[PDB]
Subunit: 201 residues, 4 copies
């Protein structure tokens, strides 16, 4: 209804051998699709709650909305944050490259901090590079599940799915290798565009 499932800007197997087509197909067709259906159903439920003036399940509906909508947002950004190797620059440049050096010291320091945040998660979660509109800087955050451990108003620039379904079929328990191979398919041109729009408040 309100939300729709976006299609991939590339073929399921375009990111191989870094991320297999098997994961991509299940991740998109099964997982992401579930969040879209869940977010719409949450809205229908909230609408029905208003019509009958019965808000007894408000706590459930607010979590259903937050969980599924955050899942939809996180994955929509995730797909575009990636592109076949060689399709995008190896490292950030111009506006983004300068900003990263300012807030992290160097590209490698930002990479090290992002990596540490990605692998240290106790449970499901995400590693994220966001624009802080209040402090007007780029920070790294560690999301719990899809909707926890983040300030309101945070604009996602670059995100990495650290839920097990994103790497288990390929890397098993070795998260370190998954994050290692992911750096090869990061679409820095997409992050650059997000950084530009985020900068206008």
């Amino acid at each position: 209804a309100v939300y729709t499932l976006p299609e991939l800007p590339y073929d399921y197997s375009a990111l191989e051998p870094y991320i297999s087509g098997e994961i991509m197909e299940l991740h998109h067709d099964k997982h992401h699709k579930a969040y879209v259906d869940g977010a719409n159903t949450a809205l229908d439920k909230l609408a029905e709650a208003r019509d009958k003036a019965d808000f007894g399940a408000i706590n459930k509906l607010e979590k259903d909305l937050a969980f599924n909508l955050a899942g939809h947002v996180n994955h929509s950004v995730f797909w575009k944050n990636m592109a076949p190797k060689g399709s995008a620059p190896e490292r950030p440049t111009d506006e983004l490259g300068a900003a990263i050096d300012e807030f992290f010291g160097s590209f490698d320091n930002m990479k090290a901090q992002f990596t540490a945040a990605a692998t240290g998660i106790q449970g499901s979660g995400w590693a994220s590079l966001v624009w802080d509109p209040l402090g007007k800087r780029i920070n790294t955050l560690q999301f719990y599940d899809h909707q926890n451990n983040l300030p309101a108003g945070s604009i996602p620039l670059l995100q990495l799915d650290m839920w097990e379904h994103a790497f288990y079929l390929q890397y098993k328990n070795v998260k370190g290798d998954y994050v290692k191979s992911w750096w090869n398919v990061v679409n820095w041109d997409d992050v650059a565009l997000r950084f530009s729009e985020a900068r206008v408040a």
Copy 2:
């Protein structure tokens, strides 16, 4: 310092009798100030980590940042969302008023849903009215603590602090009385401004 304590646009007792000046002074001078110092320290510690190449406490630092920065963000909007009785419109009008009718059916439905979300929180949290950039709609979210149960990219329009320190000294355990009194001091002018700036007309 990257973050600083904003000054109140009114005196501590300007919201009486709806909200005690005793609560306002402690809430701003003590509580809000703490989030600013915490958020600044979190960034300093992270800079320390990168310099030493030691990210052992990454999980702690990332939570310290999200919790404190979110507290800073939540209270900053909270102060401006309020104004003395009779100094602002008693009802949303124009663009904001039309949007609320479109996404909630009416102003009464919006209030009912917002109130239900406020009083039903199991633990500390917030009742929020945010702009959803993906679905291009206004939704109500129920924050847990300061940084939980919310999608990234959510832009706060109207917020209500449901932590016990925000009402205990005056209303005790009666959460219902607190929320009912709070509706009288809502500055709809500020909300309308945030609504327009959330998407630039």
Copy 3:
């Protein structure tokens, strides 16, 4: 129905001036009573769900049960963990005293660790001294809200309510003073009995 509200083993004002009778009366009559009613209602809801074979709200009911039942358990232990000054020994002795020296080094070290855990909570929570039946030792835990951040099978020995409603009317934002005064009314004889029953697996 299943759960009932236990009465205080002393008068509301018996713990003064460390904890006022005003807090005790509201905490018991209003707060604890709410958890008992909530826990029973959660069971009725789960029973009704089984009768009609409709488990659509299972996520809500499981959290309602866990939140309210944990609240009931935590406060039931909290009341007995306290007694008027002079009614119980100032420090633990015999079995308990020996165990504390073994797992913490000294009584003061356990006090310091417990205090640090109590005051550092980011949001609502509890500081707790529990018996770990797997490791067969006494550990300190920091509960989030009432039902988070604890292993299953943990047996509560000594607990301190760190929710704002437990100290705000008296100590305001100064948590440090609340914890400081609480040590004066700890009923070590009650903790000793809990330690004995916990030890038998």
Copy 4:
């Protein structure tokens, strides 16, 4: 070391075809071992803190302990709760069987409620059947991660790991098929033993 990795009461492929031996080996040798090392380190760090009188990282250490110790506890029960098909009763009997009928109406109702709690988890977690010492009854709880959404004093009787690593390699995203297969390998003899020891006859 305070904690140690328990050995499996059967071979890795003993539960096939219901649960793959590939999953069993990684789950025990890699995953469970990690919680043991983490729990031990958490205690060593806490001892370090007391010695230095520096509890600055108390919030991190307390979460590290709860998360890892809970993982250790949850998996220890999980292994024993299972046995090869045909090596244990296919249905609860005697004392345990009568108790389930008393608290759930029937075995089918218990299974339905347990299944609903298992498949509906939003994120990582567990479906648990515990003994409630306060209410003197058997309840179903839905754990988040390893250490969330549960009352203190809860004694685990039967547990099901709903984290993605527990079923992804064999069942993919179909959680329903995993839970349906798992019922075939439940060792009701072990559950009955834990039920009796939870309250000593």
